[PDB]
Amino acid sequence: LSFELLHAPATVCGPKKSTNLVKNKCVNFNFNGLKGTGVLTESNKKFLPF
Amino acid sequence: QCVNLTTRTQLPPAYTNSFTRGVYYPDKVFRSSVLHSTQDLFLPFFSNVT
Numbered sequence: 242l243s244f245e246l247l248h249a250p251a252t253v254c255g256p257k258k259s260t261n262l263v264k265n266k267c268v269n270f271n272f273n274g275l276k277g278t279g280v281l282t283e284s285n286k287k288f289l290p291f
Numbered sequence: 292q293c294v295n296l297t298t299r300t301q302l303p304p305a306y307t308n309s310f311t312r313g314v315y316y317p318d319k320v321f322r323s324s325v326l327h328s329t330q331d332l333f334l335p336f337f338s339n340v341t
């Protein structure tokens with residue numbers, strides 16, 4: 242088995258739990274296999290679709 | 292099934308310049324307001340292209 246790890250968006254995951262969005266709280270998370278701890282706010286920058 | 296061609300005119304290939312062509316994203320990761328160096332296969336600038 243050959244794994245393309247963290248080179249593209251991932252859609253093959255095993256576990257999942259129900260969670261809801263929270264703002265302005267520096268809390269731990271796991272975004273697409275990447276872990277961090279920070280608040281969630283908005284920004285004015287523009288994101289290209291790719 | 293193919294049809295042979297006998298009306299071809301003999302003409303040696305021409306060469307033009309490649310001033311600012313032959314650049315792409317080295318990886319799928321997105322970076323902003325930084326200057327990064329990546330070693331990868333690329334078309335050199337100011338060279339013949341057929």
Ligand SMILES: *[C@@H]1O[C@H](CO)[C@@H](O)[C@H](O)[C@H]1NC(C)=O
Pocket residue numbers: 306307308337338339
């Ligand atoms: C392209 O090759 C020809 C000879 O084949 C040469 O005279 C010319 O200078 C080359 N052009 C560039 C941009 O290297």
